[PDB]
Amino acid sequence: KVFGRCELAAAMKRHGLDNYRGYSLGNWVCVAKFESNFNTQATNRNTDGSTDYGILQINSRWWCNDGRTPGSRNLCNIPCSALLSSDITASVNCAKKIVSDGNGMNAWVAWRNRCKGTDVQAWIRGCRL
Ligand SMILES: [Cl-]
Ligand SMILES: [Cl-]
Ligand SMILES: [Cl-]
Ligand SMILES: [Cl-]
Ligand SMILES: [Cl-]
Ligand code: NA
C-alpha cells in the first residue's frame, strides 16, 4: 500500500506516534517519506546482508526475523514479513521500541540526515487530524 501523506499522518496518530518519546508527528511522516516513499512494501538490502522492511525500513539485523540474517536478533519478536502489511500496526509498535533504545530517532540515519533540524510540521500541514 502506498499511503497518502495525510492518511499516513492520521494512521500514525491513531497508533500513538504523535509526540511518542517527544517526537512530534511530522518527524514520523518525514522519516517514512525518505525511508519508503510511504510504500508499506518497500524492502532494501544492507551491505552486511540484513534487510530493511516496510514503511519505516526496520532492519532485520536487530528488530525482526527473516530467516536469512545470520547472527541477527529479533528484538521486536516479529517476522519481517509482518512489517510489509498494509496495516501499519506492526511497524509502529516496533518503531516504538527502536526509538526508545537510547538514540531516539537517530536510530534512523535518514531522520538524522533529512528530518532532524528541519521544519517537520510541514509534513502534516493541512491534514485534518
Ligand atoms: Cl508527499
Ligand atoms: Cl510535527
Ligand atoms: Cl536470521
Ligand atoms: Cl493502518
Ligand atoms: Cl530523544
Ligand atoms: Na533478525
Author numbering: 1 to 129
Would you copy out the relevant sentences from the publication that reported this structure?
Genetically encoded caged amino acids can be used to control the dynamics of protein activities and cellular localization in response to external cues. In the present study, we revealed the structural basis for the recognition of O-(2-nitrobenzyl)-L-tyrosine (oNBTyr) by its specific variant of Methanocaldococcus jannaschii tyrosyl-tRNA synthetase (oNBTyrRS), and then demonstrated its potential availability for time-resolved X-ray crystallography. In contrast, the genetic encoding of caged amino acids offers a more facile and robust approach for biosynthesizing the photoresponsive proteins. These synthetic amino acids are recognized by specific variants of aminoacyl-tRNA synthetase and attach to tRNA, which in turn translates codons (mostly the UAG stop codon) assigned to the amino acids. Thus, cell-free protein synthesis of caged proteins with oNBTyr could facilitate time-resolved structural analysis of proteins, including medically important membrane proteins.
HEWL_Y20oNBTyr was purified from the cell-free reaction solution and crystallized using the sitting drop vapor diffusion method. The HEWL_Y20oNBTyr crystals yielded datasets at 1.44 Å resolution with completeness of 99.6% and a CC1/2 of 0.980. The crystal structure of HEWL_Y20oNBTyr contained one protomer in the asymmetric unit. We observed a continuous density from the tyrosine residue at position 20, in which the nitrobenzyl group could be unambiguously modeled. The density corresponding to the distal part of oNBTyr appeared somewhat weak, and the occupancy for atoms of the nitrobenzyl group is relatively low (0.5–1.0). On the other hand, the nitrobenzyl group forms an electrostatic interaction with Arg21, but is exposed on the surface. Furthermore, the molecular geometry at this position does not affect the crystal packing environment. Alternatively, light contamination during protein synthesis or purification may have caused slight damage to the caged structure. These results confirm that efficient cell-free production of lysozyme with oNBTyr does not occur with any nonspecific suppression of the UAG codon with natural amino acids in the cell-free synthesis reaction.
